[PDB]
Amino acid sequence: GPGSKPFSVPVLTVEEMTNSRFPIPLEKLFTGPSSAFVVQPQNGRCTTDGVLLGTTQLSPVNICTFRGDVTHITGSRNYTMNLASQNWNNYDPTEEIPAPLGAPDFVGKIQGMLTQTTRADGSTRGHKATVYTGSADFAPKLGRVQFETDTDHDFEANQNTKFTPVGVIQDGSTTHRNEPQQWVLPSYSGRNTHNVHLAPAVAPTFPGEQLLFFRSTMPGCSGYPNMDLDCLLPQEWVQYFYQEAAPAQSDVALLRFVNPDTGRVLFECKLHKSGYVTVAHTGQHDLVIPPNGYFRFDSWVNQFYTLAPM
Amino acid sequence: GPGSKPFSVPVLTVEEMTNSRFPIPLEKLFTGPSSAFVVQPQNGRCTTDGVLLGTTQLSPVNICTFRGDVTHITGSRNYTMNLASQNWNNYDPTEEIPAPLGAPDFVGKIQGMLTQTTRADGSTRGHKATVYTGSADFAPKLGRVQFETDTDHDFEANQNTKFTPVGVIQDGSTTHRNEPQQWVLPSYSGRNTHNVHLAPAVAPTFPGEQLLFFRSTMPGCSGYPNMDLDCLLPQEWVQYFYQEAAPAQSDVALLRFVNPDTGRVLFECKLHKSGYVTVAHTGQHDLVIPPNGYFRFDSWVNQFYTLAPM
Lengths: 310, 310
Fold this sequence. Notes:
The structure is a homodimer of 310-residue chains. The first copy, chain A, is mainly β. Chain A folds into two domains: 1-62 and 176-310, Nucleoplasmin-like/VP (viral coat and capsid proteins); 63-175, Elongation Factor Tu (Ef-tu), domain 3, CATH 2.40.30.120. Chain A has one helix and 15 strands. The longest helix of chain A is centred in the C-terminal third of the chain and has 10 residues, at 235-244. The PDB classes it as viral protein.
């Protein structure tokens, strides 16, 4: 970037920031144990010195979008989308990425709208549509995704078509909140293929520590979905580290979460250079924060620094 | 004072950035005359020293969203939404802004989805919905808007409801591309009321200059809409100026648009302190830019600096 500032984090409140895993605002901070799952999201991954990882790209509005053109599957209301790149050029499967940037990084049924414009006359059309990212034929890395829609006839072939995500759904005849599964990665090249070029899984290692999650509630569109969505970094931090690209002077940036209403620190945390945050706590806990609170970088420390409990 | 923290613009390409007037990426740059109509958008308004204006707020995903509770209009598929604030608290109509932050700043028919969760059991529902921002009863400043939907019964009252925008429609006539009207501000308190606390209208005043517009194509959902959408500043520039808060040393920052493939400047432009851009050109022109090109601040200059023609 064009500046010449030492390392910092942005002065932004949680509510001023955006989830890096779905195009919705952040609402709250949450910490819980993670030994019972694998935490390997591919969106919202960036080192503190500005290296984008996984499927992470810069604008939050592109997260969980797809673009391309569609072909109807006869005898259904389903369509295959042959993907374009984000700027409508040809999609290139040989790029060293797990999937097109911004592709969904969790297994679930994401609902939104497919929209389309006919080039010759500028006629337009749009329908509700869902992508099941755990389906065998979800293969964005190969350039193909299938959508279930509300039409069997009202999309043209060979015309620009976009999917805009809105929320998630669940089958209400089944155990409530059984999906989405935010920590289950899709198989980006389809069932029984191996993902490539992934951002690594993350876990706290220091005793007494847990991940700190930046949490939103995904809109629900049908049934009884699990709408919790946790990201490792706000999108604005991805954007800021990309732009600043300040070298990490140690493995960990010590951050204090400041309450400007009282002038006191509420808690401190470790921002790991590979791009995730830990805190000293044991158990599930919804943090209760001043709405005008923000994070502040105070010191470079190592991974063996002992945090004050919160 | 002299020696103030240096101003800059981010190193981001047009395609890496986001429209500040609808939650979609930027696609291109455009210049044309604007003397016959008023250019007074309320989103994407910020001074170079970081003062947000109009209805402008920080995250692009919130633009053209609404949140609140809904009330069915008997005998129709229409719902009144009684607005909440962006963080689900009560909305305050006496705040010194034109309308809730991020509200639409153009007259048009915006289609998306209304989604809702019932608190007691986590049941959910989602439906297509259109808001007409030129409607007599479009009064977001007062805390009320109307949505035409695809249901007459499947929303509950007194439960959190969100509108997520997707794109625009055209109907009510056979004249193509006559709407949306991107430079017509809504009457934010309803028909025959006066708007308040507006960001000012902008115009080129220097002979031979025109505004430079940051352009996207809104998705279309029905009919033959005009999908052009021009903002005065990318959302990332709003975010960056807010965060950096570098003092303006004059009223005009000279930017050069750099082509890293050649090392040479393609064009130069004026970034006015009050937050818009002009170029020296006469006529309508779609700029042909290298996709990796970006803007670079080179100097503060005087109001009446003469730009190189482009």
